[PDB]
Ligand binder design. Structure first.
Ligand SMILES: CC1(C)Cc2c(-c3ccccc3)c(-c3ccc(Cl)cc3)c(CC(=O)O)n2C1
Length: 121
């Protein structure tokens, strides 16, 4: 759920999910349209697609367990949905960390009309 995801992001990047990643670019936030603005926005695009492969699950509210094994994120065994949700989030946290160097404040609170184009999962 958003509770585990936010904790994961904070630990990984040092940034608070809200408002660092909740209204960033075209995909980090509600829905998404157009072409991702940068690497960080691409992370959210892929994350959005990852959740999209889980029709019957509820990523926003289903809680999973995870632990750190010397920095590494390890998803604990739970329900099938919980395991898959955790893997989606873990990937996003790592992706955000790998692209922290290009994170740009000009993409915070990005205007909707500037999101134009198409990109399929
Ligand atoms: C789909 C959203 C646009 C709606 C939403 C909430 C949200 C919260 C409450 C009620 C409605 C929506 C939170 C969110 C919430 C709380 C924390 Cl601690 C972190 C992130 C996040 C960031 C994320 O995890 O992707 N989002 C993205």
């Amino acid at each position: 759920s958003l509770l585990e995801f936010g904790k994961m992001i904070l630990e990984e990047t040092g940034k608070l999910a809200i408002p660092s990643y909740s209204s960033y670019g075209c995909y980090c936030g509600w829905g998404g349209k157009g072409t991702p603005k940068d690497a960080t926005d691409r992370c959210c695009f892929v994350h959005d697609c990852c959740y999209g492969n889980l029709p019957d699950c509820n990523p926003k509210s289903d809680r999973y367990k995870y632990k750190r094994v010397n920095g590494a994120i390890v998803c604990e065994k739970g329900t099938s949905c919980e395991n898959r949700i955790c893997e989606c989030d873990k990937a996003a946290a790592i992706c955000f960390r790998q692209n922290l160097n290009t994170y740009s404040k000009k993409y915070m609170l990005y205007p909707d009309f500037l999101c134009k184009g198409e990109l399929k999962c």
